[PDB]
Structures are given as C-alpha cells and as structure tokens.
Write a protein that binds this ligand. Structure first.
Ligand code: MG
Lengths: 89, 43, 274
RNA sequence: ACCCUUGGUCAGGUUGAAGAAUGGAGGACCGAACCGACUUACGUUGAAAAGUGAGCGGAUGAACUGA
RNA sequence: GAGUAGCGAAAGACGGGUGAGAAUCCCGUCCACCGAUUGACUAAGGUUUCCAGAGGAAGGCUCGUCCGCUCUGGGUUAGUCGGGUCCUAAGCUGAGGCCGACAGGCGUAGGCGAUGGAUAACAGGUUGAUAUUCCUGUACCACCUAUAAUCGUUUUAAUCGAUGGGGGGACGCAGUAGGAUAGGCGAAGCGUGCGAUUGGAUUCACGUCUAAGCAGUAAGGCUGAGUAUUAAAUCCGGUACUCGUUAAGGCUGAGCUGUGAUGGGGAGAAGACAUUGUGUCUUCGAGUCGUUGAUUUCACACUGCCGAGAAAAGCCUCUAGAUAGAAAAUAGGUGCCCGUACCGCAAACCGACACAGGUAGUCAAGAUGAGAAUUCUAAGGUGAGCGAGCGAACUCUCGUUAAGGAACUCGGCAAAAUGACCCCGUAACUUCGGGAGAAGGGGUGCUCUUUAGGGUUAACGCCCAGAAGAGCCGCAGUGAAUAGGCCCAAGCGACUGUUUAUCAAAAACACAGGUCUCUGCUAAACCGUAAGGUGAUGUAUAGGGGCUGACGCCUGCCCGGUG
C-alpha cells in the first residue's frame, strides 16, 4: 500500500503544460480516494501536497482486427503540490 | 409519430435486469434456461 | 340555502350550489388533519372492483370522534366548518380544559353553544348520551351499533332516527329508511338531526362538476356488445330482450333481494323498508 | 386504455354574472403556442408500414404535457 | 425490366490555394435563408460520434484532397453545481404473523423509492478539446486542534440536549391592483470617422460590474404572547389582569444604497514594441440623464371562490436526563464517492436509412402592432451530399383571363369573394342569458394650421392619447403580409365534451336531470380458493345496478302469460 496505487505517471502535452506549473499527473488505481493519493505521494516523494483532483474515464471501444474489445477503465488524479518536486526523470 | 420503445435505462433495468429475475422463482427460471443455452447476456 | 345561477351559459343553465353561509371558518386545523390518497376503485391487487370512481380534487381527512368518549368535560363550539368527505358539515369543539376535536354538525349548532358527552348529560341538540337515558320520542344521530365502536348509523346530511321504545337490553329505533331495528342500550347516540338539510336539493349542471367529486361516466348497459353485458348487442337499439333487466355480472337487478340469509341481525329487525 | 403520487404549460384581446358606478363569473367569445384529424388536393415500389400542403376544431378545462 | 425509375422540401455565383484528380475540400468578397428560431442552454436517450495530425478501399444516394468514415495520439479536474450522503408521497418490499394442494398470496413494525421538501461560490481569465470543477481575486458552510479575556453549587450554567410533546415546514383555482427590477428606447460623457455620385457637415459605435458583508425597506402579517393559573414540561394546547386597538413602531416577514472598496482585475476601444511575419505587448481609457417596463420578483401576498386544495425531515423552543465544562473577541488545519467530453426540434435520440414524422423545460432583441400574429432585420447559425442544358407532350404547385356567372356536378367539391381598426345601425325568436360581429351603410393616405388632454417633473424635456380646420397626391391610402362570406327553412341530437391509433367523428357514447330497484353496515355490489381488500376510513340527503337522457306540457289501457 501507498505504492500499489500509483500505477504509472502520465506524460503528454497537457500534462507537460501542467508540469510547467507544480501540477503533476498520475495514473492511479481505480479503487482509491483523493486522501489516499495525497498520503501516498507525500509518503513516497516526501512532498507536501496542497490539493488533488480525481476523474474516472469509461472503458473505450477498441477493435483489433476482427475482434472487438474494450480498453481498461481508468482513474486519473492531478496533484498541485506547493513545495517539492515529483521528479519523473 | 410516437413509435414504440421510448428508451429508459431505469425502467429497462427495473422491469428486467438481474435482481428482478432473481426476485421470483419464474425469474430464476429464465436465468436457468439462459445458462443451459450458454447465453452471454443473461438479463 | 340554495343559490340559483342565472343562465349565462348553456352548460350552466339549471345549476345550483350551496350558499355556504353556515360555514364560519374556511380553513382546517394542522393537528386534526391526516392524508387521504384517492384509490379510484382499485384493490390490494390493483384491479377495478367498484366502477365509476377516478380522478378528483385532492382532499384531506378530518379525523373526528364519532365515539363521543370524553365524559363530563364540557365543550365549546368554536367554528362550524366545511368538510369535503361528507354531505354534512363538521364543528370544531374545544373542551373545557384544552383538548379540541371535531364532531358532526347538528341542525342548529351555533358558535358559542356548549356540548356535554356522558350519561348525566341533558337532552340538547349536540350532547351525546347512551340510549338507556334517551327519552322515547327523541331524534338521534350517530347511533353506535356495538358498545364503544363509535357512530355507524345516521350520519349523512339530514339523517335522524327516532327512539321508539325499550325492550330489555335493546331500544327500538326507526332508522331513516323505515326499518325498526333494535340497538343495544349501552350504545351512544347524539340528540338532533345532522345539518346541510339542503344538500339533497342541489343541482350539479356541468358534466365536469359531477366529474369533480370523483365520479366517472357510467355506460348504460344497453349499448355494450354481447361479450360485455347481458343487454348488449342487437342490430339497432333494442329493448331488454330477457325476462328481467340484468346486471353486468349476470344477476337479476330489478327486484332480486340480495341480503344474505341466516345473519345474526335477523332477530333484531321488527319491520323493514328499503 | 384507465388510474395513483409529484411537477410543468396555456401570447394577446373581448364580454361583463352574483354581490349608474363598482365587481371580475363562465366545461363564456375571437385568436397564437399546444393538442386534434373535418374537407380537399398531393402522395400510393411514398420523404412517411398513415404523412405533407392548404384550409379546419378546442384553446382556464370532462384541457394539454413531463417524471 | 435498363443504363430505365430514383438521387429524399431550399440559392448560389466568382477570385485565390491545395492536389494525380475539384460545381462538390480550405480562405476571401458578394448574394441569399432563419431569426418565439435552423440561435443559445439544459434534461431524457445514445455512448467516444468530442479534439489535433494523417489517409481514401469501403460508408457518404454524385464527386471528394472532405466528414458523424478509417489509422495514430489525445481530451471530462467541484466541501459549495446535480445525486450519494438528509426526508418522505404514489408504489414496491416486509422479520414475526394471517391465509394457502406444493408453488406461493397478503400484511404489521421497519426499510426502499423523486417527478417534491432541506442543504454553504460569485465574477473574470484561460486551451485544440474541460471548467459555479482549473487558475486570479474575494467568500461562505461544516468539522478538528491550540488559545480565551473569567461563564461559574456543575442540579441549574458561558450553556450540553432525545428516538418523546408541541410549534413550524405546509402547499388549491381565478382575478385585479401596487412598489421598485432585468429588458428595450431617446438624449449628456466617451470614442473614430467627416466621405470623389447631386448635395450636407449638432454629419456610426460605446455608455460598465457579483456572491459575500451591512447600513437602509416598498406593497406585505400578526398580539394578548401580558404577570399568576390547568407518564410532565414555568415558552408551547387551554385561562385572568395593567400600559391597552400606541405603530410610539414592540414583533415576524422582505429583487433596495449617495463620500469609500471605486486615481482598481473588466475597464464595446484605434494610443503602445524589437515583435507575438506584424497576426501582438505594455499601459491608457467614458459610464450620465429620463423615459417606457414585464409573462420576472415581492407572492397564493391580497381579494374572491368551491371543487376545499401531500407527507416526513432540516429548523425552532420544551422537558425527560447528562455533566465540572470553552464561549468569547483569535490563529492554524481538514473536508470523501458518483456525474462532468460530445449530440440533445437532432446526420450522434425513437422511427431498418446522413428518413419532409415524434422528442419535456429555460432565455428569447429591433421596426410594425394589442400580441410569443404578420413582413424585414439584429445577436447568432445556414445555403440542405448530385449537376449542366432545353424551356415539347403529359402530370404536379402557382398567377392571370374577354362576355356569361353554378348553365358543371350526386352535391357550389375545389377555387373565388368577406376579413383589420373607428363611427353609425341590427329583425323575427328567446329558457331574457342570447340571437349578434346579426343583417346593412360610411371612413382610413400625406402635409400644414390649430389646440385640447393625464404621465413621470423643480422645470426643460420625455412618454401615450384627442378635437376642429385648411390643403396635397395616386387607379387605388388597414396601397404589401397577417385577421369572419352571409341569409331564409327543415330533420337529428339539448349544449362543452368522447369514440373505431391506421377507410365511419355522427343522428352513435357521455352528460346535467328524471325514474325504478337493491342495500341497516363484516351493507349491498365487486376482486380473490382464503387471508386480505375496493366500496369507505362513506352510513339511506350514502353506496351498487337497470332504464331514460337539458328544459317545458305530459307519460293512456291491460296482471291473462312470464320475471
Ligand atoms: Mg408535445
């Protein structure tokens, strides 16, 4: 726990623009709440977060060849830490 | 003209749906036949 | 009294309504009002059992004590009010030490008269007392059938029974119809006739005014099809082509006595009527 | 189809009941929204498995509509 | 069948560019259509159709470089918005229980369930896609911790309180009024223009700002609530006095502001630079007056009516109890799950389709008007997924027609004609309401003179209406659009209403009114095997059934037969 919920970071032009500010973006597990993400990040990176925002993305249709499928459901959290710097190197 | 099937998620899942078929024995039947048939959408 | 509308419209020619003069307060009480959700002929299953019943103006129930059981404590008539559930009116009464409850309005109850329930109560329009203490010849309303259950007989606008005599544990009473029944002496009545004596003289006029009390149209039986009614069918208008007029469900309707025999009330009815 | 609970809608003008002015009654009048389907023409392998155009009827009520 | 029918309502033209290819894609100019909407929102429903690159097989009724298509990568951020969280209606479930051949049905306590009640965030900026969600500004509601300026037997208190009692929430329909308010419309400020077609030079745009926090309050409601008194309550449900109906204004209600915040974000802005190929950045910019004003808000307020118009919780007091504690004037922190893209009178929804149908609600400007009618237009969208010719027959839609005017025809079907507003007139017949807009006549343009009126007012000025004259012009003056043909007489049904969705809307059905009959209340009648219900929490002035069907005059004779 506190490491199993941060699945991956999110890198993209909008995430990059957020990183211009102190907002960092992560791909978190689908069964967590804002408080738990705050705790986990401030536990790992030793940062002090000010706020965090969560959103749930629906499974998207993806056809691979002749077989249709669905992508996995996603839950994304945005942190806006004050002091500190999650480095994604 | 107003045709039939004015869709509605709530009523669709109320009149039909897993818990509604699990409320009556006859409801339990159709799930039984649908599994015997190997159906993928049971309710 | 009755007000006769002027024929300003056809749908309103012969209309008549109650002047509502006897009504002194035009609003109810929040604590003696409970909800009445209209059922419209439908039963525990959800099927139409009685017909000609449907949508109508909402109505709040005005709980009253037909069982005039507060004994000895006097009560003042505060306001005679309109009640939508009943042909008659109701009168708020305040008891001599704080409680207030509704009753049925007698013919001449005027705001300010006192009302006494009990057994040592006087014989005055409104006071309730048991039938062992009601003189022979008195007009009585709200006559209880079983000791304590409450008034069940004579309660609609202009209902009055006359105490005609005394047997042993039963008093003889000529009910509104004409039956001379025997009601146990330990049962209560109320002295006087029930008001709104002009309720029976009103004319409705509008189809819609009849379709505001919760009545729905009733379809004369002689025009339904043979599969809907016994009088149905025929090419053209037809007479009743049966030995007797019949009912929707197949049971004679112009004369057949439908009172269950072997009832435990047969020993108590001296002469019948209706 | 009917009903139960809870909501919503009805531009604008006219008439002038009960209680000369006053008053504001009506399944009252004319008429848009809305609802309907009377006549006609078109359509009839249709734009449509019942519609469209032109007129037409109710339009504060036994109204119409949502959940 | 045949290269035939069809290509699914409509306005396109042209210059430039892109490409293997262009009526069909991109940009521009002009033109045209909608504009109580083809415009902006928001629901239901659909789920990724949303955005940026790229492609062109297929799908687009043609083409296609294009797209709601294909490939790649992206996009939905909430303590306050809507839900969960709080409450409950109709219904649905229902422990025990009642009834039931099994199955199971019913039902109490209790739960679930909004379409309702209660609940704390506003403005501006912002990208290709989100924003009461992000950021800037300023707030508010709960909760916790530290501290407290002394509240003070911790029974009572600074004050803690039920799951109980009471109050409240808390509600219909229709009328008018009234106060300000968004709008819109004229002129002070501000702005930028002053013209190459004759002429003119007091010759188009802007014109502002919230929640919060107080200060005030405009219709608008109520006082005896008066001390003391009657599993209990000394706030409330019932009683008795003084100041007494004061409005002094005591009380509870509740679209409203000068000097400040306001020499400040936004300051419809032309002013400003190296440029943000000049497409930009500083930093600089007016908010005034006085008219009309709601279908909005006070507010179901007030008044009237009969058809007599939810519940529960939040909330407030009050006790039963519970307890040595924090309120007070601060300062720090904490606030979770779900929905958020996109379409939503629609090519993303229900109609098999990029279908001429259906799809609840909110905002809805100017000119004309009474109007949300009608014609043109603003904000803003759009030119309809086939075209180019020729203008035969014949169909369809539309306009006009000499003389006659129903001679057509089963029938004036269709078409034609009246239509608005103002004035004058209006019959028979009537249930005295009506008939009735009956019928039938006349006028409406424009300019000038004149001069009543009332509306805001300090007045100028601004609105909205009158009357009498004198002219002028056309064929025509409600010069377009929109807006009753009428009358005489017979049946039928009293009337408004409802019916065969999809060949019949009527004389058929309803109806108000009559009458007969049944029914005494565990009523009759009805649904169920029963339990349970409906009737009805109704009681013979009530309920069920049969017949007839406003209203007026009447409703004869027969009881042999059957019931
Ligand atoms: Mg509709």
């Amino acid at each position: 726990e506190a490491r199993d919920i941060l699945k991956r970071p999110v890198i993209t032009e909008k995430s990059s623009e957020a990183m211009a500010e102190d907002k960092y973006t992560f791909d978190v597990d689908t069964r967590v709440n804002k408080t738990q993400v705050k705790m986990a990040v401030e536990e790992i990176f030793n940062v002090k977060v000010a706020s965090v925002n969560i959103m749930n993305y629906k499974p998207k249709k993806k056809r691979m060849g002749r077989y249709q499928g669905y992508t996995n459901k996603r839950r994304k959290a945005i942190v806006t830490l004050k002091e500190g710097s999650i480095d994604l190197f | 003209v107003k045709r039939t099937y004015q869709p509605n998620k709530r009523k669709h899942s109320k009149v039909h749906g897993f818990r509604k078929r699990m409320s009556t024995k006859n409801g339990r039947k159709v799930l039984a036949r649908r599994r015997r048939k190997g159906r993928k959408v049971l309710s | 009294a009755i007000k006769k509308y002027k024929p300003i419209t056809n749908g309103r020619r012969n209309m008549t309504s109650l002047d509502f003069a006897e009504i002194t307060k035009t609003t109810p009480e929040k604590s003696l009002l409970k909800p009445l959700p209209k059922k419209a002929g439908r039963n525990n299953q959800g099927k139409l059992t009685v017909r000609h019943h449907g949508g109508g103006h909402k109505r709040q129930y005005r709980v009253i004590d037909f069982k005039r059981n507060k004994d000895g404590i006097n009560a003042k008539v505060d306001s005679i009010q309109y009640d939508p559930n009943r042909s008659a009116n109701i009168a708020l009464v305040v008891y001599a030490d704080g409680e207030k409850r509704y009753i049925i309005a007698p013919k001449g109850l005027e705001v300010g008269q006192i009302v006494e329930s009990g057994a040592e109560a006087d014989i005055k329009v409104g006071n309730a007392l048991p039938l062992q203490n009601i003189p022979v010849g008195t007009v009585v309303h709200n006559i209880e059938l079983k000791p304590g259950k409450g008034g069940q007989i004579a309660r609609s606008a202009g209902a009055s029974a006359q105490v005609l005599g005394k047997e042993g544990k039963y008093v003889l009473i000529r009910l509104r119809s004409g039956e001379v029944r025997m009601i146990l002496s330990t049962c209560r009545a109320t002295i006087g006739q029930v008001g709104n004596l002009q309720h029976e003289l009103v004319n409705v006029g509008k189809a819609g005014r009849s379709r505001w009390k919760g009545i729905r149209p009733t379809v004369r039986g002689s025009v339904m099809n043979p599969n809907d009614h016994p009088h149905g069918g025929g090419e053209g208008r037809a007479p009743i082509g049966r030995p007797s007029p019949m009912s929707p469900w197949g049971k004679p309707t112009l004369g057949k006595k439908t009172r269950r025999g072997k009832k435990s009330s047969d020993k108590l009815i001296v002469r019948g009527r209706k």
